[PDB]
Amino acid sequence: GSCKGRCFELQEVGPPDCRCDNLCKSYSSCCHDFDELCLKTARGWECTKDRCGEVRNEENACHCSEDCLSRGDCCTNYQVVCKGESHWVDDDCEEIKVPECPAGFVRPPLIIFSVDGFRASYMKKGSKVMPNIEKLRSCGTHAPYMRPVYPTKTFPNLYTLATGLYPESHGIVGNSMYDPVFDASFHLRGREKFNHRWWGGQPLWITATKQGVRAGTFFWSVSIPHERRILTILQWLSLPDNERPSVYAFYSEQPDFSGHKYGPFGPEMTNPLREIDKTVGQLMDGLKQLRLHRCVNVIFVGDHGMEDVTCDRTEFLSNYLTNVDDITLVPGTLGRIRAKSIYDPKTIIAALTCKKPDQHFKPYMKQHLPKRLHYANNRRIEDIHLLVDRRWHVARKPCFFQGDHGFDNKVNSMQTVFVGYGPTFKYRTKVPPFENIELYNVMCDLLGLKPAPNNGTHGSLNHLLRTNTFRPTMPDEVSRPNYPGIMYLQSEFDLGCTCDKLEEFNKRLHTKGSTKERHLLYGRPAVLYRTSYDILYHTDFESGYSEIFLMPLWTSYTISKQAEVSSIPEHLTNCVRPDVRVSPGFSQNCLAYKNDKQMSYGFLFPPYLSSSPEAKYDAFLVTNMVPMYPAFKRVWAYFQRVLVKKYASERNGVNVISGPIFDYNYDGLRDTEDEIKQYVEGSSIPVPTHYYSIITSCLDFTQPADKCDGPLSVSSFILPHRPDNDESCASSEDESKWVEELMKMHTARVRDIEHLTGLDFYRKTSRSYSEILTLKTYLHTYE
Ligand SMILES: *[C@@H]1O[C@H](CO)[C@@H](O[C@@H]2O[C@H](CO)[C@@H](O[C@@H]3O[C@H](CO)[C@@H](O)[C@H](O)[C@@H]3O)[C@H](O)[C@H]2NC(C)=O)[C@H](O)[C@H]1NC(C)=O
Numbered sequence: 001g002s003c004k005g006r007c008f009e010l011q012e013v014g015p016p017d018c019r020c021d022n023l024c025k026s027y028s029s030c031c032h033d034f035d036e037l038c039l040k041t042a043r044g045w046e047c048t049k050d051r052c053g054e055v056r057n058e059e060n061a062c063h064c065s066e067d068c069l070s071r072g073d074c075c076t077n078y079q080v081v082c083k084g085e086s087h088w089v090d091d092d093c094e095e096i097k098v099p100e101c102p103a104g105f106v107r108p109p110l111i112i113f114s115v116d117g118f119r120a121s122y123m124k125k126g127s128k129v130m131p132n133i134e135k136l137r138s139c140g141t142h143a144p145y146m147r148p149v150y151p152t153k154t155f156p157n158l159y160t161l162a163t164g165l166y167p168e169s170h171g172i173v174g175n176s177m178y179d180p181v182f183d184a185s186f187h188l189r190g191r192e193k194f195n196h197r198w199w200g201g202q203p204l205w206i207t208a209t210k211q212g213v214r215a216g217t218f219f220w221s222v223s224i225p226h227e228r229r230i231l232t233i234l235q236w237l238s239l240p241d242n243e244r245p246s247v248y249a250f251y252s253e254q255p256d257f258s259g260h261k262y263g264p265f266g267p268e269m270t271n272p273l274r275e276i277d278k279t280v281g282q283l284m285d286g287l288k289q290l291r292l293h294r295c296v297n298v299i300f301v302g303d304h305g306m307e308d309v310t311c312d313r314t315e316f317l318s319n320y321l322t323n324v325d326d327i328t329l330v331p332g333t334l335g336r337i338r339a340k341s342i343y344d345p346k347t348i349i350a351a352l353t354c355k356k357p358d359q360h361f362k363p364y365m366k367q368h369l370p371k372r373l374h375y376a377n378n379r380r381i382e383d384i385h386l387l388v389d390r391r392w393h394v395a396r397k398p399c400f401f402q403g404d405h406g407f408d409n410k411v412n413s414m415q416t417v418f419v420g421y422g423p424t425f426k427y428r429t430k431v432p433p434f435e436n437i438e439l440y441n442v443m444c445d446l447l448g449l450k451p452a453p454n455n456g457t458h459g460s461l462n463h464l465l466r467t468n469t470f471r472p473t474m475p476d477e478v479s480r481p482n483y484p485g486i487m488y489l490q491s492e493f494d495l496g497c498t499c500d501k502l503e504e505f506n507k508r509l510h511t512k513g514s515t516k517e518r519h520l521l522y523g524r525p526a527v528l529y530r531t532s533y534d535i536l537y538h539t540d541f542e543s544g545y546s547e548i549f550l551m552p553l554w555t556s557y558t559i560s561k562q563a564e565v566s567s568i569p570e571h572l573t574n575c576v577r578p579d580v581r582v583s584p585g586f587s588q589n590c591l592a593y594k595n596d597k598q599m600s601y602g603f604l605f606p607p608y609l610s611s612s613p614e615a616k617y618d619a620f621l622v623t624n625m626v627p628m629y630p631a632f633k634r635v636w637a638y639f640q641r642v643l644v645k646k647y648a649s650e651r652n653g654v655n656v657i658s659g660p661i662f663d664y665n666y667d668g669l670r671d672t673e674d675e676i677k678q679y680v681e682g683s684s685i686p687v688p689t690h691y692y693s694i695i696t697s698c699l700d701f702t703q704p705a706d707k708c709d710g711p712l713s714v715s716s717f718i719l720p721h722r723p724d725n726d727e728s729c730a731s732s733e734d735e736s737k738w739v740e741e742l743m744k745m746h747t748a749r750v751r752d753i754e755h756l757t758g759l760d761f762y763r764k765t766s767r768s769y770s771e772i773l774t775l776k777t778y779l780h781t782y783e
Pocket residue numbers: 165166169201374453454455667668669755
């Protein structure tokens with residue numbers, strides 16, 4: 001019944017016996033003497049000279065006695081004060097070529113130091129404010145920033161860090177959520193969150209335990225002061241070999257709490273940042289005392305940033321909806337809307353769509369959210385979502401706080417931090433920004449664990465590490481293409497299509513020639529599922545034509561800086577030509593489009609970028625055609641006619657791969673045929689949910705895209721294929737006032753496209769596969 005000799009013990013005592021562990025306070029279940037024996041505060045957290053060599057007094061918070069290292073309960077500055085040693089921060093940086101662990105240590109321990117609400121720009125405050133953090137940052141490995149997951153809230157991001165999964169997959173989709181299968185709500189406050197039913201995937205601590213690696217208790221009751229959390233980690237590190245964990249987590253509530261109170265740019269933020277730096281210094285001094293400072297891998301990481309948000313920048317749903325009593329709103333920096341009593345979702349969305357000129361949120365059905373957010377495939381995510389403008393809140397009805405977070409994860413103010421320091425991380429190395437979903441694999445590598453299946457791309461962060469356990473290999477192609485020749489005659493086709501001599505004289509029309517060389521710069525995409533498709537060559541483009549979907553899976557072409565834009569002539573406006581390499585039965589037909597009043601068509605290779613009048617006729621082949629709503633053609637035609645040439649002019653040429661995506665079940669993965677829920681009327685021509693483009697050029701812009709010796713540069717998009725442009729409030733204006741903005745909102749990683757298409761890109765380059773994996777995870781943010 002007593003905590004004597006049991007403070008912060010690792011074995012969790014079962015109900016009903018009283019507890020002495022990290023979380024006992026949170027369950028209101030600690031022993032009667034917990035707050036006294038375990039949460040001692042007497043004399044503070046720093047040795048003074050007068051305490052050196054004292055006899056142990058049990059009331060003291062930490063000790064300066066000669067027996068204190070045998071418990072790991074010395075104050076962290078003990079040796080500096082009593083043994084003449086220096087502070088870790090005052091020592092010069094010295095590369096750690098190999099781990100330097102003391103006796104009993106099998107592997108380098110990992111410590112995760114997580115800081116809530118630590119905005120990336122706070123790092124600009126430098127060594128005068130944060131000397132310890134700045135040393136870790138400059139001497140180890142760091143990124144300019146780390147991208148969090150949406151929503152940019154604590155619970156979703158801490159659990160993504162732990163699992164390598166998107167919130168839609170791990171289940172922690174918000175700080176607040178409702179599960180219709182449990183008929184219950186999860187909240188930051190309360191007991192509900194402690195039930196295991198909420199938590200999916202496999203977090204790091206469980207991955208560790210399953211593979212024989214001991215994990216410290218990651219979670220800390222808020223009432224445990226930060227100094228005690230550090231001392232407890234150091235005490236655990238002092239345990240015998242068979243009881244000592246290999247992985248630990250420290251969590252701080254700061255700088256989030258001050259961020260909320262004063263905003264991210266308040267002068268009041270300096271003191272919270274100074275205190276966090278002190279805590280880091282305590283940890284590093286503590287490790288130095290135990291001879292672990294050149295043995296431990298340390299990860300200093302945040303969960304999200306902070307934005308200026310005040311109560312007078314609140315949009316109220318009662319100013320748009322006349323029936324606010326019928327809905328339930330999860331409010332704030334995002335909006336999720338649910339019925340109160342199981343109202344009509346389509347009328348709700350319409351009533352929230354572009355109703356005031358300066359409206360500071362936008363409504364979406366979850367399947368229409370930008371696919372980069374990966375925020376749809378979970379029954380806990382409400383069908384109706386509001387994406388709120390940075391600096392604003394949305395509330396149901398009608399300052400103490402000046403900051404908040406939760407917004408779109410590509411917003412600058414939401415970006416957070418990453419520093420890795422220790423023998424396994426690189427020395428004085430800057431790395432590009434990356435997403436927090438990638439760290440679980442690295443933390444597994446750092447511990448010798450096989451990661452559970454997750455949304456990271458294993459190998460994309462090998463460049464953070466001095467030594468790598470995991471070597472990525474490129475997946476094998478599943479479906480091999482056919483390469484059909486000119487087989488059929490014009491007379492054999494009856495597609496109901498029309499058109500308005502020199503092809504006859506060209507014996508090697510549609511042969512490979514130099515097409516593959518100049519239009520497929522990085523090798524053909526591999527098809528990673530089972531299907532039947534044809535490679536088709538042309539002067540200006542190459543494509544992989546699916547005989548199942550009756551359209552290309554991909555279309556590839558290169559446009560030089562100097563390329564000419566031309567118009568579609570009047571006589572070719574409605575031209576569609578049958579492809580003599582592909583059978584009538586595996587082709588689309590024009591009558592289906594005549595029959596379908598809602599549906600039109602577009603082209604994947606644009607007629608506007610043909611190299612000659614002769615070549616232009618290839619662009620009107622039936623095998624280059626794809627179903628497009630008239631509304632979407634305004635977007636697509638502008639992209640094709642105007643933006644591609646712009647990008648070619650800005651980037652010293654570009655290579656473009658475009659194609660359809662089918663994702664009717666909004667799971668972020670390529671649909672099977674059975675999952676396709678819409679076809680062109682009276683046909684088996686499937687309707688894409690989205691269209692992608694991947695735009696590649698040389699990172700060194702002094703080299704043209706087709707003669708690039710080095711690293712590549714990529715931007716990509718996944719555009720929703722919608723029958724209206726309601727998403728774009730300026731869409732009644734000229735396309736130059738809104739199309740490019742739409743596309744930037746739907747920016748994407750090549751990896752996102754790979755999941756949605758079952759294709760593998762960049763299979764033939766001069767770059768290493770790990771470098772390619774980094775390229776595939778890149779997101780062009782426009783921030
Ligand atoms: C993000 O990563 C997660 C985890 O890898 C992906 O979720 C996983 O998706 C696969 C494929 O749909 C699921 O596989 C299923 O396994 C069961 C096992 O019996 C099988 O019956 C099914 O036929 C199927 O093979 C798997 O359950 C699921 N895992 C988890 C933890 O949810 C997810 O697809 C990834 N997301 C993206 C956008 O890439």
